[PDB]
Every structure is written in C-alpha cells, then in structure tokens.
From a paper:
CspA (also referred to as BbCRASP-1 or BBA68) is expressed on the surface of B. burgdorferi and binds factor H and FHL-1 in the region of domains 5–7 with an affinity measured in the range 10–30 nM. The atomic structure of CspA is known and consists of seven α-helices joined by short loops assembled in a ‘lollipop’-type arrangement. The dimeric structure possesses a cleft between the two subunits within which a putative factor H binding site has been proposed following in vitro mutagenesis studies.
Presented here is a new crystal structure of CspA showing a different conformation between the dimer subunits, demonstrating a degree of flexibility which has implications for the accessibility and conformation of the binding site. Despite flexibility in the dimer organization, the C-terminal lock structure is completely conserved, suggesting that these interactions underpin the assembly and therefore the biological activity of CspA.
Numbering used by the authors:
A (entry chain A), B (entry chain B): 70 to 249
Amino acid sequence: ETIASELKAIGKELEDQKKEENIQIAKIAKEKFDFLSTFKVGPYDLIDEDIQMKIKRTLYSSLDYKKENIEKLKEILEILKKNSEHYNIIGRLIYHISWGIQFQIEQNLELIQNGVENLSQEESKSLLMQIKSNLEIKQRLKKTLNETLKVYNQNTQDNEKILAEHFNKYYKDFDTLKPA
Amino acid sequence: ETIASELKAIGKELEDQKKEENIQIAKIAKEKFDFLSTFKVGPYDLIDEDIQMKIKRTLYSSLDYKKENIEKLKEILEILKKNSEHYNIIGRLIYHISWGIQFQIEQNLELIQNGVENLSQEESKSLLMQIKSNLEIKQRLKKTLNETLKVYNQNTQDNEKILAEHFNKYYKDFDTLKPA
C-alpha cells in the first residue's frame, strides 16, 4: 500500500486491454485476414495455437487491427521468407519479441490475480516496475512497426517512380528505343 | 532484280516468323498466361481481337514467349496503371510501338504478296529499306524490354536488401526498438 492500490488498478487496465484484443482478434478470424493462424517461418514448421495467440495479440494490437496494415506485414514477412538467411531475424520479431512480451504480461497478471498481499514491499515495487517496462516495450514496438510500414510504403512508391521515368525515357517513340 | 530476289526471300523469312509466332501465341493461350487478351489501359476500355493479336506478336516475341518475363511485364504495367498520369506512356508502348510495328510489317508483306514485279526500281529499293528498318526496330524493342525487366528485377532486389537492413537494425532485441 498504496503500491497494492496501483497494482490492482494496473492489473484491471491489462485485463481490459486483453478483453478488447480478444474481441478485435475474433473479428479478424471471421473477416478471414488472420494470416498468423497459418504463418510458418520455415517450411516444415509446426504451429501452436497458444503461441500464435500471443503473437496475434502483439502484432494486431501494434497495427490497430487495420486490415491494410495486417496485409502489408504479411507481404513484408513473405519477402524476407524467400531468403533462408532472414529466418533468424523473422524469429527475433515473431517469437522473442511478439510472443515474449505477452508471456511476461501473463506472468505479471498472474502475480496480481494470486494476490498482491502475498508479495513483500520489494516484490511489489519490482512487479510495478516490470509492468511499466513491458507496457513501454508494447509502445516501442508499435512505433517500430509504424516505421517498418513507412519503409515498405516508400519502396513501393519508389518502384512506381523508377518504372515511370524508365517508360518516359525509352517508350516516347521508336527513336527513344535502345540501339539494336 | 536482284532486289526482287532479296524481297521474295525477306518475305518468306517474315512469313515463317509469323507462322512460328502464331503457334507460340496459341500455346500461351492454352497455358493460360495470355494477359494481353484481357488487358485494358483505362477501366472502361473496349478490346479489339485484331489489335491485341498484333500487340501479342510484338510483346511475346520480345520476351521469347517466357512465362516468367510475360508475368513480370503484366506486373510492371499493373503498377503504372494505378496512376492515371501513366496512361499515355503505357499507350505509347502498347499501341504506337507494339501494334504500330506489326501494322507496318503486314503492309510490307502485302506489297511482296501483291507482286514485286508491280513495283518500280525505286519502290523496290524503298520497300527493302523499310523492311530492314522495321526488323531493326523489332530488335531495338527486344533490347529495351530486356532493360525494363532488369530495372524491375533490380528494384525488387533493392526492396529486399532495404527491408533486411531495417529488420536487423530494429528487431535484433527489445533494446533496438524505437524509444518513446
């Protein structure tokens, strides 16, 4: 106390975030653009529903459950998936970060659900700090995926510009063609 | 004579080219990757079978009837089609150049089929020159589409490189994320 009051309030906050994401994720599954349900890094990779749920929670939250952004992320991952050298860095985002955050959050929610009374003044202090660090990461990631989408959108746009300048250079007439 | 011998020979050559392209085009329609059959520049554009045939002859010849290249051209045109500002330059390639070449070739084949005897020494000289100029253009274009495909392949490759360096920069760990 009053860390016990702070913890119960931040626990209720996290449980609300979880309830709204459960609803928002359910609609994406019906609207049939839940790519993470079928997403494999390698080819012969097995998919666990519980692990995927946590990944969906992180990735669809950071993209504000927007179909446009969710599809664009699918496209980005599909591009990198082509080269087996990118398999590790995809896993860093999908597992270590996206699943990792939710895994820590579940553990933190459980300590609150178990009872804040069963925790010492030092344990209570650390739990509040940990929750705040995880919530900060959940935002850090959101701001990173935004930059990722900006990088992908910029490249798409640049490709159109380059193709257009090439077309205007060479296809103006018969005389603008490359020599035989 | 012997321009009459040269013309009858170059006419037979053009008729063989036409016969082999007719076969090669027929197989593309069976293997269901003949995008030009359904290709519109604008949205409400009407498609003429005879005009399209000539476009198919030029474009599928230049790409050596390769499915990979034919699909890549479809992708390039689809990208530029998004902006109405690129509608004119697409038409320069599709109609003025691709249909235009075949239209001139048909006229040249007809003058040979009509009879080289019904042509003066000056008309015979000009027809041979014209045929050679058109055959040179058919090569000029082939060497341009090759560069077009190289530009598109380079852009695709550059996009993979950029996305990879972005991923390794920001998704290495939790600490490599963008701070708030």
